[PDB]
């Protein structure tokens, strides 16, 4: 289309206003925190993504605030950001120029589902492993994503690299201070969120990540449900009824409800027959009523399901090498050093 | 299929165990409160619906308790109910034998949407009017449905009669006693429910009923949204941002959230051009942040949008007469007598 030139600031590094020109703008996503366009940086030819949200100017943008702080190979990189205005007065926009990634787990999963097939287990391990790695990263800053779903997981089909994106709902959780329970995409909401909890923790990202893993093994969302009551019923049909204890660990003030019938179901009678034992094991360890009983993200990466990735021979199905998975920084493993012995293979 | 014979009790009237035989059982619905089959009563040939829910036997079934109490031409009739057992011990089922209705607003709406068309406004008036009439009825018993959605609105395409069904989530609300906020189908949840409210009132059925009306005029759900945050954003784009007052009327204890941008949108820029002014008016009067500011169900029936139904000539598009709409009982209008002068036409 037309060429656009703005004064932008780099995301990370020294704050030095610089000139940026981009073109070939098309829309490629929407959200309750703005539009996402694809674009081409003029002078380098590189494709980028620009997310445009309306800004109050009277209040900071937390998405920007968080993004500036991150830097990890599994989280989409913020290149620059700039403001702009619209047709109407007192109407400023914040624009985040981020790396552009070709696919998203949501599409790759839909594409396979449409083909009446399941995603090759090797991809399942690779995508899920990188999701947990990122999850551990942002949690170590005390940041909870609050919106983990397949559409927010970017993929590069060729390199098999996954990148967490959309920090629109992200927030740094602090003990004692309350949080709204209405964030997070239906199918991925942790029980505590459905129950109204406002004192939940980062472990809600793990429940979600677990919903993603299960969805990738089943070919459809594992806990669908129009109402929260239906989701709770789907969940109870797989984990069994919650003990009074558990319901309390999810949401202290809670308000009792009916429910009852069926309890402690076959976790193995959930997935297709060929489903790898370890994949089901990881799910159980991820979808737990008690939030503190859920594996942490780093412990998830150390799970046996991800052993193939640690294998010295491992290669993508297209003969190419696997993405970065062991280059853990000391800071990255400091939350649970002992894991290093499983995280970093012998040949490293 | 096979013939089945049970000892059943009549829903309404004297409790006199009687023998019932039915056959031609097929499934026709599912839910978090049981399965719904279609069946044929042997000796009369009549088609009925049987909803089978697992029962605790140690606790009453509120759905049954409520259904026994109702009796109104716009609410599906309970004919009998009986218990039965399953393959496993300590596993009893409660079976509700109800009237069978051919269609549901959900299908009629999908069918038209598929045909790339909108439901004829006359049907919109007829269906919505009967929904409100029923809604007024159950509210007068202090019963809030809690699950008003198109799939729970049964229709008889020929007679154009609508019948409210599925009282699985229904409950008699009492001031002071708390209620869970996770009932109700996503798209139809009143803001107070999204905000976590546990002291909400029957007016939540009205917000839903309003979502239905709007969906029937647009051809798709008016407030879609994966997360509650997205729904709130869709809602704010049509009603404008909630004043601090309003947010308080929805949920006293609430926990603040980000949000902001856009406010007070064109209620008329929402629907197609040909959309009747009055239909949009009714919607505004139904989708109100402040719950007490929402029209009551009976006032909704008295709205101008429903004037065509009061017209002396009015006939279904198939030349047949319109269903019952004015036979209000004195008990029915006692909540707001003055409405009688608009409810019951001159020629009545
Ligand atoms: O390449 C991207 N970088 C992003 C950064 C953020 Br933050 C949000 C989205 C994107 C993004 C996206 N890339 C896509 C490719 C196909 C379909 C949708 C998207 C998308 N987004 O919807
Ligand atoms: O005719 C009916 N009486 C009912 C009473 C209760 Br309570 C719940 C459902 C029904 C019901 C139903 N009739 C249908 C016709 C087509 C598709 C679904 C249904 C259905 N139900 O899904
Ligand atoms: Cl590596
Ligand atoms: Cl009449
Ligand atoms: Co969003
Ligand atoms: Co239901």
From Swiss-Prot, chains A, B:
**Outcome, altering residue 62 to A:** Prevents the phosphorylation of phosphate-primed glycogen synthase
Name positions with the PTM Phosphotyrosine: 182
Record-annotated residues binding ATP?
A: 28-36, 51
Broad class of the protein's primary localization: cytoplasm
Post-translational modification here is noted as:
Phosphorylated by AKT1 and ILK1. Upon insulin-mediated signaling, the activated PKB/AKT1 protein kinase phosphorylates and deactivates GSK3B, resulting in the dephosphorylation and activation of GYS1. Activated by phosphorylation at Tyr-182. Phosphorylated in a circadian manner in the hippocampus. Mono-ADP-ribosylation by PARP10 negatively regulates kinase activity.
* One Gene Ontology term from the biological process aspect of the record: regulation of microtubule-based process
> Regulation of activity: what does the record state?
Activated by phosphorylation at Tyr-182. Inhibited by lithium.
Q: Where would you find this protein in the cell?
A: Cytoplasm; Nucleus; Cell membrane
Going by the UniProt record, its keywords in alphabetical order are: ADP-ribosylation, Alzheimer disease, ATP-binding, Biological rhythms, Carbohydrate metabolism, Cell membrane, Cytoplasm, Developmental protein, Diabetes mellitus, Differentiation, Glycogen metabolism, Kinase, Lipoprotein, Membrane, Neurogenesis, Nucleotide-binding, Nucleus, Palmitate, Phosphoprotein, Serine/threonine-protein kinase, Signal transduction inhibitor, Transferase, Wnt signaling pathway
Nuclease as UniProt keyword? no
Kindly state which reaction or reactions the protein catalyses.
L-seryl-[tau protein] + ATP = O-phospho-L-seryl-[tau protein] + ADP + H(+); L-threonyl-[tau protein] + ATP = O-phospho-L-threonyl-[tau protein] + ADP + H(+); L-seryl-[protein] + ATP = O-phospho-L-seryl-[protein] + ADP + H(+); L-threonyl-[protein] + ATP = O-phospho-L-threonyl-[protein] + ADP + H(+)
- Active site annotation, chain numbering: 147 (proton acceptor)
Tissue distribution is:
Expressed in testis, thymus, prostate and ovary and weakly expressed in lung, brain and kidney. Colocalizes with EIF2AK2/PKR and TAU in the Alzheimer disease (AD) brain.
Q: Mind listing the GO molecular function terms for this protein?
A: ATP binding; beta-catenin binding; dynactin binding; kinase activity; NF-kappaB binding; p53 binding; protease binding; protein kinase A catalytic subunit binding
What does the record give as EC number?
Answer: 2.7.11.26, 2.7.11.1
Describe the location of the Protein kinase domain by residue ranges: 22-306
* Record flagged with keyword Nucleus: yes
Top EC class of this enzyme: transferase
Its quaternary structure?
Answer: Monomer. Interacts with ARRB2, DISC1 and ZBED3. Interacts with CABYR, MMP2, MUC1, NIN and PRUNE1. Interacts with AXIN1; the interaction mediates hyperphosphorylation of CTNNB1 leading to its ubiquitination and destruction. Interacts with and phosphorylates SNAI1. Interacts with DNM1L (via a C-terminal domain). Found in a complex composed of MACF1, APC, AXIN1, CTNNB1 and GSK3B. Interacts with SGK3. Interacts with DAB2IP (via C2 domain); the interaction stimulates GSK3B kinase activation. Interacts (via C2 domain) with PPP2CA. Interacts with the CLOCK-BMAL1 heterodimer.
Also noted in the record is: Higher expression and activity of GSK3B are found in the skeletal muscle (vastus lateralis) of patients with type 2 diabetes. Several potent GSK3 (GSK3A and GSK3B) inhibitors have been identified and characterized in preclinical models for treatments of type 2 diabetes.
Which protein are we looking at?
Glycogen synthase kinase-3 beta
Q: Which organism is it from?
A: Homo sapiens (Human)
Instruction: State the covered range within the intact protein.
Output: 35 to 382 of 420
């Amino acid at each position: 289309s037309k060429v656009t030139t703005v004064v932008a600031t780099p995301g990370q590094g020294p704050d030095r206003p610089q000139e940026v020109s981009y073109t070939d703008t098309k829309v490629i996503g929407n959200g309750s925190f703005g539009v996402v366009y694809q674009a081409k940086l003029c002078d380098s030819g590189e494709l980028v993504a620009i997310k445009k949200v309306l800004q109050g100017k009277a209040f900071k943008n937390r998405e920007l605030q968080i993004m500036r702080k991150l830097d990890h190979c599994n989280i989409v990189r913020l290149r620059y950001f700039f403001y702009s205005s619209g047709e109407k007065k007192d109407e400023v926009y914040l624009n985040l120029v981020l790396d552009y990634v070709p696919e998203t787990v949501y599409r790759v999963a839909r594409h396979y589902s449409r083909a009446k097939q399941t995603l090759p287990v090797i991809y399942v391990k690779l995508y899920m492993y990188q999701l947990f790695r990122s999850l551990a990263y942002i949690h170590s800053f005390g940041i909870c994503h609050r919106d983990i779903k397949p559409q927010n997981l970017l993929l590069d089909p060729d390199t098999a690299v996954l990148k967490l994106c959309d920090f629109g709902s992200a927030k740094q959780l602090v003990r004692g201070e309350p949080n709204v329970s209405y964030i997070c995409s239906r199918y991925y909401r942790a029980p505590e969120l459905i129950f109204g909890a406002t004192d939940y923790t980062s472990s809600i990202d793990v429940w979600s990540a677990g919903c993603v893993l299960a969805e990738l093994l089943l070919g459809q969302p594992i806990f669908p449900g129009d109402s929260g009551v239906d989701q709770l019923v789907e969940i109870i049909k797989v984990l069994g009824t919650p003990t009074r204890e558990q319901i309390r660990e999810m949401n202290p003030n809670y308000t009792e409800f009916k429910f009852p019938q069926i309890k402690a179901h076959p976790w193995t009678k959930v997935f297709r027959p060929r489903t790898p034992p370890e994949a089901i094991a990881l799910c159980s360890r991820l979808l737990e009523y008690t939030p503190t009983a859920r594996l942490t993200p780093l412990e998830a990466c150390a799970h046996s399901f991800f052993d193939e990735l640690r294998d010295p021979n491992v290669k993508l199905p297209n003969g190419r090498d696997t993405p970065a998975l062991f280059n853990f920084t000391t800071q990255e493993l400091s939350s649970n050093p002992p894991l290093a012995t499983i995280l970093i293979p012998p040949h490293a």
